Amino acid sequence: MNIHEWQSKQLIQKYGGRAQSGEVAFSPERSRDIAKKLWNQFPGCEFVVKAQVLAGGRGKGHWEHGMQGGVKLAKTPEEVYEIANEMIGHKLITKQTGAKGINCNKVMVCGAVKILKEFYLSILLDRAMGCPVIIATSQGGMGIEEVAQKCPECLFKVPISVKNGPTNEQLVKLAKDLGLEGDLVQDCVDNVKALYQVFDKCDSTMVEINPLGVIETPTDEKVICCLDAKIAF
Amino acid sequence: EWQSKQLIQKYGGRAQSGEVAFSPERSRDIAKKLWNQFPGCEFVVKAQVGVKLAKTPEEVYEIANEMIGHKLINCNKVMVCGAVKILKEFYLSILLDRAMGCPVIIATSQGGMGIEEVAQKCPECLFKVPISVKNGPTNEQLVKLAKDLGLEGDLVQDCVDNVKALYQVFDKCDSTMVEINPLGVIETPTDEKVICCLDAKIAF
Ligand SMILES: Nc1ncnc2c1ncn2[C@@H]1O[C@H](COP(=O)(O)OP(=O)(O)O)[C@@H](O)[C@H]1O
Ligand SMILES: [Mg+2]
Numbered sequence: 469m470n471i472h473e474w475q476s477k478q479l480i481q482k483y484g485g486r487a488q489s490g491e492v493a494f495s496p497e498r499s500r501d502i503a504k505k506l507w508n509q510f511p512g513c514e515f516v517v518k519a520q521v522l523a524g525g526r527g528k529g530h531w532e533h534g535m536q537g538g539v540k541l542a543k544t545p546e547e548v549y550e551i552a553n554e555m556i557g558h559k560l561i562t563k564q565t566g567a568k569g570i571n572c573n574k575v576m577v578c579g580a581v582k583i584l585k586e587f588y589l590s591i592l593l594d595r596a597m598g599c600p601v602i603i604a605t606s607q608g609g610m611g612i613e614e615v616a617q618k619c620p621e622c623l624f625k626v627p628i629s630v631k632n633g634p635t636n637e638q639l640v641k642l643a644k645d646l647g648l649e650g651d652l653v654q655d656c657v658d659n660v661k662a663l664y665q666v667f668d669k670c671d672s673t674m675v676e677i678n679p680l681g682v683i684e685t686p687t688d689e690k691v692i693c694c695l696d697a698k699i700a701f
Numbered sequence: 702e703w704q705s706k707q708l709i710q711k712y713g714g715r716a717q718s719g720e721v722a723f724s725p726e727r728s729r730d731i732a733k734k735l736w737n738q739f740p741g742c743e744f745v746v747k748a749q750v751g752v753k754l755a756k757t758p759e760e761v762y763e764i765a766n767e768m769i770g771h772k773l774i775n776c777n778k779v780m781v782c783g784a785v786k787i788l789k790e791f792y793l794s795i796l797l798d799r800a801m802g803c804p805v806i807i808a809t810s811q812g813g814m815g816i817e818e819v820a821q822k823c824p825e826c827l828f829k830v831p832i833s834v835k836n837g838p839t840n841e842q843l844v845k846l847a848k849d850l851g852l853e854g855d856l857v858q859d860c861v862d863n864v865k866a867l868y869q870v871f872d873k874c875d876s877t878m879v880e881i882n883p884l885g886v887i888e889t890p891t892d893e894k895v896i897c898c899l900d901a902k903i904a905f
């Protein structure tokens with residue numbers, strides 16, 4: 469099976485990648501404390517509550533009891549408790565679910581960040597070719613399988629040699645084709661190179677980052693960051 | 702500070718309490734977790750009873766290793782504060798003015814130095830606001846003080862709210878002084894301007 473979001477981001481960081489793993493919470497009280505302690509470091513910052521359930525379309529979905537969205541903004545730790553209280557212990561309905569619901573027993577609480585660009589990127593083991601291949605496109609919010617059927621020319625594909633792995637020219641070109649420029653290019657290479665170090669050194673089948681974004685830091689420094697992660701085995 | 706900075710938060714005020722660390726290793730961890738919540742953020746390391754900017758958890762470790770167990774009374778603990786974008790520096794204090802026998806609120810737009818120096822060279826920079834201990838600070842007075850410092854929009858009301866919470870720490874603690882140097886206008890990670898107490902001192 470695939471591991472949860474915040475678990476994937478953690479492994480990505482364990483190999484030198486920048487990802488917003490936030491902090492998990494198995495209760496709405498715990499989630500409130502997380503946002504509260506974070507206000508000590510960045511007072512006035514908003515928060516984002518992300519249901520931890522193995523299925524896509526969380527931002528699109530909704531909850532039975534009236535709440536809309538699996539990824540919702542929160543202005544205060546109290547709002548974090550509200551949202552979290554409606555998530556933990558309830559069922560979420562997304563596109564991958566139809567209407568059978570998925571039991572949500574935990575959520576992830578991360579700080580609200582300003583996003584400048586959103587990209588798709590994944591490291592897939594092309595079995596037909598027996599080699600890894602890197603997919604990407606400048607259409608973060610859309611979905612990989614949706615874009616593929618309607619626009620496969622929207623995707624950039626880069627087969628990877630199993631020996632040396634990524635080629636610095638391959639990665640530099642991919643970052644350049646995605647519209648990146650300046651320090652974000654090398655930063656994108658560093659993270660993407662870390663994604664392979666996660667893909668290969670962990671015997672993984674897929675490392676999907678949707679969206680891989682250009683975010684601003686609290687001091688407004690642009691840095692590549694994985695705002696979502698799925699790792700299949 | 703931790704007690705005070707929490708008291709402001711206890712009574713409904715914004716205060717960057719950061720987090721204390723009793724060793725360079727601990728300091729490096731605090732900065733690491735913050736990169737899970739706001740990746741790429743910088744950090745500020747404060748030596749507790751001086752302040753250097755750090756770009757990475759490893760830099761924080763370096764700076765902490767220079768402080769803990771060294772000069773500037775001995776320093777045996779540091780406070781790791783996320784690097785927040787600070788726009789304006791203000792100074793604000795509440796005092797039992799023995800001369801007038803009533804609480805008074807002093808404030809200036811030069812929050813980068815001791816109040817002693819500002820008065821001498823610039824006496825126009827300070828703003829006295831005598832407060833009736835019973836009637837307390839009146840909304841009219843605090844709004845007048847807010848606009849006296851160059852605040853507009855939600856900040857004007859945002860200032861009034863924090864000033865009130867500070868007087869409660871002064872009233873409900875019977876404290877002789879409540880000093881906020883600096884009181885900053887800060888941008889949140891999403892570029893929202895808010896008032897925040899960046900340093901606190903409570904005496905008796
Ligand atoms: N920390 C964050 N701050 C602001 N927006 C965020 C943050 N994390 C995620 N988002 C936004 O929320 C959207 C939905 O989250 P995501 O993890 O992609 O869920 P899903 O793709 O399953 O719907 C993302 O596409 C992104 O635009
Ligand atoms: Mg996603």
Ligand SMILES: [Mg+2]
Nearest residue numbers: 582684688892
């Ligand atoms: Mg910004």
